[model samples]
Target chain A: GEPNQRPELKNHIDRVDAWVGTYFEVKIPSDTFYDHEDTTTDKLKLTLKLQQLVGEKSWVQFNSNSQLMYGLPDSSHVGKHEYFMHATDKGGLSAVDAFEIHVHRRPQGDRAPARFKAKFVGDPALVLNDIHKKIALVKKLAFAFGDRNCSTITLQNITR
Target chain B: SIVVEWTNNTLPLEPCPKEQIAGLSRRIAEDDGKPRPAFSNALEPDFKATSITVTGSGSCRHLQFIPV
Candidate 1:
């Protein structure tokens, strides 16, 4: 005795950043949309449409079957692009989600910075052990760059 | 939008996003204040240490997110 359930979307991100002259691709997770009744995404259909476009719309492409969004942005395409994605099941139940892509301009060739080095300050290894079962040991990470002037140096990304 | 400031070119990392402060605050308010996973509060070292690789140069300037 299973009741009808609407298709649901998950794992969609709010924002994505890209740079001019660089190729960008974002693949929605294989399990991004699901329905208990459908059981398999193949039994469902996915679609997307651009709600907003900043510049030339020809640069971007999305494949609903594979759920992959890929494109190469140029100088004229430096702005925000938004899209609405949908997932529907055979029973007419559907789900919708929205996300945005922001394209940024790259630095001029003459202003390109030098090679930089980043380290974890001390021994890279860190263990989080409890001291006397009352307090937890804490460690912080530090980094260094090759540039002497901090004006042009930018730490743009970090990940675990 | 998320905004972060670096002090002397050093940025300290935190566990949560300030943009979601209201939601996180509500979660903490309703928390039971007890550690989960049963033995999470045990005296034994819970898990192994995590580490990261530091690259010196020859890295791509562009950043992208690839979901698995």
Candidate 2:
């Protein structure tokens, strides 16, 4: 006769395995500024800072064969975010491309917020509006929100 | 991401071969220069260490063995 086993054990194992194959793939962007910048110059400096802030923090773990897992173990820092990648060619100008990842945890309240809402902060309207605001406001907000707590915004010509 | 591969390995249900175990134990002893805990101790005859086999990977933060 089959012996009785705890159903909860199987559920626990399933949950853990579910988290095993999760992962995310982020492509670094190509931009002109990165292309013109030499490794010794400020352009390179900015690129490195952006890479550390984005690439290092963006990692995907495997939970199952079909599933990709992301997000830090800590819940205090949970939200949707975008990362901009700047890659330089041999000529020393940066090519810009942007990658995005959506992350969320299981809802645990009477009315959980939508995951999409988290990404709304990165919307073009919000970003442009934020940029159009006073330098001090932008700086303060960027200090509170941008990577590395630095708030310097430079306007570069957009390439078609 | 980096991927490393090994091939043609067999899983053993029992302990590692005695000679290999002894050699490993001796190496640990010499490194530490003192008797340590079971897996860490150099002088114990019945000390055991857990082993695992994993394949097909991406990234792992923490992994451990559990007795089935």
Candidate 3:
């Protein structure tokens, strides 16, 4: 973005990995948000705003271009089986390519509505869609979803 | 779409040892009836994290060892 302009870049987290009961950090890439117009602003603070898109596709991006998408996955936000991201530094905005997260109880063992639908108004959906629509954010994950058009990792917890 | 498998169920009952990997490679190639490098070996790890891929796709394929 130009100087004095709020830094904005459309980017996404594809097939991020996470699990239940534990919180992990997802690092956002510099290229994701960086543009030729913006430089020197290496540090960024992510401010996430919550909302549905124009409809049909869900969108995830810097809510404010300032700071706090996934404080994240406090398990207090999102659902039993879900994923979300946001975060760090750029110039003085504190922009970094990343967010901290906690994941699902059983994202793979449920119906489309159960695993993909929203349980709360402010919940972060697992299907990370880009607001700009440059990308669908449709890709693979560490675990499997039984080939619901997405790639499956096929990790069966057959037994202990 | 790119597909990656680890300890795939399509594999045999036993893990393919390092020595036998080459034989298996040929079998996969034979079915496709494609060509080969004419110069290759079967001794290295079947799937490897190379310098180039490590910075890209490698990020998606991460491993963690949880202690019980």
Candidate 4:
């Protein structure tokens, strides 16, 4: 049953462009069921909108590309924001997996250097290690989903 | 050999051979394809090209990888 295991859902804030801009890359590990089917035209209906708190509603559209979803916060959107991607299949709308991204306006002066400094000092090593780990995990998941048809499926590594 | 001309008035930092710069540049560029951390502390003027190491006070601990 593990081999046919349904796709597990996981969401992470891949990036925070607080000073530069705000965008996050959401990864959906490939599942055996979705592997064989061409998902190019298929869409992963994502309900992404600024949420004030839990149980609040703000729904928007998001399309998936090869198991990856790019979510960008509107420039007007500031402060804490929450979102969730509700995937639909023949089973109907599945559970909603929530994700959050913070969008802050850059402070005055050359904040690039300071922001970069904060990033470097915050935990550069951990950040890099996490990226590598996520890529490895995605690759393993993809391989498992591809099964004998692994040749056609390749997961791209997510680096900075 | 790779020549790194810092934008600041600091000393020019050259690392690796010019022949290796292309490969190194490609590697860095490709690694940056996704969201990666940016480096802090602009290279100082007195800085000169030295053997590159992943470990540094401001170095990013994250391992670099390409999607491919």
Candidate 5:
């Protein structure tokens, strides 16, 4: 939740370069701006030029951070926002630098627990019935399996 | 006190007194040693891909203990 409000970009840089084909998202909230109570905007429309510049398949990873500034309190009604997207690891904890910016209570479990899953709720499944898809799927599976566990584990030939 | 990008001006979110930023920075960097979500293999999914020997019956053990 937002405390009160903010106006414009203070320290954030504008442009960023990310790997091709990587996907991310950026979304705005349904709530109206502090002064502009019309509630007309529900999404961020990345301009056609901006979209092309970002390259194919890449997107602005959406989150609450995008909703922070709703048209500078003192500026004109139209709210313009610019965010730089880069590779997840390359950005160096770009999402708020993950500090106790607004602390409420004690954290669960004394130890800090960190968790991460690549894309969505499930793995990125490759299309089947195609040799290229099979190869891509195998490569991804092998990466997930890792090099240390590279030794082959075969259950022998398959037969009913 | 960490700075908040408020409006055209940037300001400290809190009144960071002596040694707050450094301590806070250190705190954030310190790891509490918990498994990250990206860390798979935390649980062993039951593999139905099974093989059976020609001459024997097999049994497995499953046990769980919890506070009552």
Candidate 6:
């Protein structure tokens, strides 16, 4: 084994998919750096650093003490982000890695409210003045009553 | 009034309007095609830390074993 050697990084994914509003985290193993001279786990002085952030740097965090990369991306951070990770040993020898993370918008289910079209077909003078008005009032009451079931309903008008 | 038409503009299997005529003097609404709204049934990630450790960075000499 060489008396002094550069640390070699291993077992890290090059790309990760992330969703906005979701807590995202990735970690480099403490033993990711393999050094011949610094064989002792405690003496290896392995370290990981995040750099060259292509997106909002404040959104993501890297803790050298724990080797954990964590962040909660938001809508503004949606898209591809390129990040570089640096792993170094006690000897100042280091290995650099390219990390790519894609942020995406969370899927939203389609939601539509119940709707009804009410129109009176009676005498325009009698209907609009009385029956049309009565049915409209009744329609509103029905929807208000249905609101007690679970969700709200939307009422729309039709050409009279 | 002769008749009042009620048209439903909602997705499948949704609930229809109620027939509470307590305030009305006569039955003026009819022909909903069905008694109630016809509705159909709708069909409906974690990370773990690695525990294996090597005494000294587990150099390239460390052999990986996979069980078939």
- DockQ (Cα-based) per candidate? 0.04, 0.01, 0.02, 0.05, 0.02, 0.05
Ranking of all candidate structures by their lDDT, best first: 1, 6, 4, 3, 2, 5
lDDT at position A81, candidate 2: 46
Per candidate, native contacts kept equal: 0.02, 0.00, 0.00, 0.00, 0.00, 0.11
lDDT of 6: 0.39
On TM-score, who's better, 2 or 3? Answer: 3
lDDT of 4: 0.29
Candidate that would win on lDDT: 1
Candidate 5, which segments miss by more than 4 Å at Cα?
A: A1-6, A23-58, A65-160, B1-68
- Tens-digit lDDT track of model 1 for A10-114: 667577787654445677665777788886555577777663444334556677777777664556778998877788888888887798889887433222212
TM-score for each predicted model, relative to the true structure: 0.42, 0.23, 0.25, 0.30, 0.18, 0.40
**i-RMSD per candidate, Å:** 15.4, 24.6, 16.9, 18.8, 24.6, 27.7
Better of 1 and 3 by DockQ: 1
Model 4 segments more than 4 A misplaced: A1-24, A29-61, A65-67, A71-75, A107-160, B1-68
Q: Is the docking of candidate 4 incorrect, acceptable, medium or high quality?
A: incorrect
Q: How many backbone overlaps does candidate 2 show?
A: 31
Q: Per-residue CA lDDT of candidate 2, range A1-160, in tens? A: 5333211110111111111111222212112232222432123322321222422333323222222232221232245445443434344444443444444442221121110000111223322222222222223322222222232221111111
Q: In model 2, what lDDT does residue A120 have?
A: 12
Q: Candidate 5's residue-wise lDDT over A59-101, tens digit each?
A: 2223333443211011111123344322111112212211111
Q: Which TM-score values does chain B get in all models?
A: 0.18, 0.25, 0.25, 0.21, 0.19, 0.15
Q: Candidate 6 lDDT, tens digit per residue, B1-68?
A: 22322222223222311222211101211233112221100000011111111111112122211110
Instruction: List the global CA lDDT of all models.
Output: 0.42, 0.24, 0.28, 0.29, 0.21, 0.39
- Highest-TM-score candidate: 1
Rate residue A114 of model 3 by lDDT.
Answer: 10
By summed lDDT, which 10 consecutive residues of candidate 4 chain A come out lowest?
Answer: A111-120
